[PDB]
Design a protein around this ligand. Structure first.
Ligand SMILES: Nc1nc2c(ncn2[C@H]2C[C@H](O)[C@@H](COP(=O)(O)OP(=O)(O)OP(=O)(O)O)O2)c(=O)[nH]1
Ligand SMILES: [Ca+2]
Ligand SMILES: [Ca+2]
Ligand SMILES: [Ca+2]
Ligand SMILES: [Ca+2]
Length: 341
DNA sequence: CGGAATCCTTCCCCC
DNA sequence: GGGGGAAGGATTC
């Protein structure tokens, strides 16, 4: 079982560099401007030049600006990045039919059959890196190991512009040594629940009774961490399909008035339907971000597909359910469509 | 800020 | 008891 994982370097910012190569070597910050005030919003991502001074995804644009007032600041152009991404995914398909497209810039390949060992896999990685650099001018990091999770960890270790193999020797070392928060699927909230159980590396998950562990982090994540620590995680590379299309926008002011919020809600529906492109959903959810950054939602599944008129009509009802049930002001409002025919 | 998958809890109808 | 599904949250990348 040889898995090869491809993670494109600093993706959105690198694409902006490709479309304007004079950006190269400058600090580049790709931003999402919320329209609430001058430079309100956040960093989607940044190239390494900006990153090494602390400008990274998630910080406010305002804070980025005071660290690096002279950086290049660009609005996020997701549609472009998506088209570049799928071209790169298409080239990867030429190296295996077993491909899992995990996000806009991550893919796993099953190269068990195209390759005999880690030496040949490491060479196939170099072929792949070079191919993408030649055809689209994008640097990527490659991780190689015996399963998806360890291929991913490999990439995290080698980035940027890297390639790394975690064989079987190193896999066993990492179970004892890798900080458990660096395990994919362990975010901040789970990392902290695991600390309380005194689980600081993967190996610790075996020293603890299962029912306790699933008591804390849930059954799925429990079985997940256990198989990994046991060196028997072996999930298949699986072709993934879109299950839901949606869109959420930020309001210029926090509000509670139905008629203040509606045009934002309707805009979200309009873009959501364009994105849907001949897909017909049976389910709609109205999603609200309240003033305290909390996320509330109300939804409805239909026996049939939802027409645009029905989306418009139903969304107002669900938004009304939200305002009836939750006393707080709304900051962001949007919709999500799913259960496609 | 933003898009989306998977998972968890609760509640429900009912064999 | 338990299957099957929906709803509203929680959590991750
Ligand atoms: N709007 C938004 N987009 C994000 C955020 N984080 C990541 N993205 C987008 C932009 C990234 O370029 C892309 C890929 O995610 P990554 O975690 O791999 O970061 P990135 O590629 O920028 O750099 P990396 O090489 O992994 O260090 O997804 C975020 O907090 N907000
Ligand atoms: Ca990346
Ligand atoms: Ca990534
Ligand atoms: Ca983490
Ligand atoms: Ca049950």
């Amino acid at each position: 079982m040889i898995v090869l994982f491809v993670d494109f370097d600093y993706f959105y910012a690198q694409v902006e560099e490709v479309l304007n190569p004079s950006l190269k070597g400058k600090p580049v910050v790709v931003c999402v401007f919320s329209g609430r005030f001058e430079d309100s919003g956040a960093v989607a991502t940044a190239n390494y030049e900006a990153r090494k001074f602390g400008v990274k995804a998630g910080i406010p644009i305002v804070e980025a600006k005071k660290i690096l007032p002279n950086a290049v600041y660009l609005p996020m152009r997701k549609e472009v990045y998506q088209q570049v991404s799928s071209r790169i995914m298409n080239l990867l398909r030429e190296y295996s039919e077993k491909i899992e497209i995990a996000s806009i810039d991550e893919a796993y390949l099953d190269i068990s059959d195209k390759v005999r060992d880690y030496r040949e896999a490491y060479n196939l990685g170099l072929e792949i890196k070079n191919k993408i650099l030649e055809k689209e001018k994008i640097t990527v990091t490659v991780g190689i190991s015996k399963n998806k999770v360890f291929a991913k960890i490999a990439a995290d270790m080698a980035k940027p512009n890297g390639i790394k193999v975690i064989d079987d020797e190193e896999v066993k070392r990492l179970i004892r040594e890798l900080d458990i928060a660096d395990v994919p699927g362990i975010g901040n909230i789970t990392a902290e629940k695991l600390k309380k159980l005194g689980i600081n590396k993967l190996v610790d998950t075996l020293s603890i009774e299962f029912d306790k562990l699933k008591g804390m982090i849930g059954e799925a994540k429990a079985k997940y961490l256990i198989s990994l620590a046991r060196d028997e995680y072996n999930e298949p590379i699986r072709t993934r399909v879109r299950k839901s299309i949606g869109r959420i926008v930020t309001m210029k002011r926090n509000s509670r008035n139905l008629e203040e919020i509606k045009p934002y809600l309707f805009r979200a529906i309009e873009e959501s339907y364009y994105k849907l492109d001949k897909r017909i959903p049976k389910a709609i959810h109205v999603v609200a971000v309240t003033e305290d950054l909390d996320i509330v939602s109300r939804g409805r599944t239909f026996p049939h597909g939802i027409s645009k008129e029905t989306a418009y009509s139903e969304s107002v009802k669900l938004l009304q359910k939200i305002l009836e049930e939750d006393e707080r002001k709304i900051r962001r409002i949007g919709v999500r469509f799913s259960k496609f025919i």
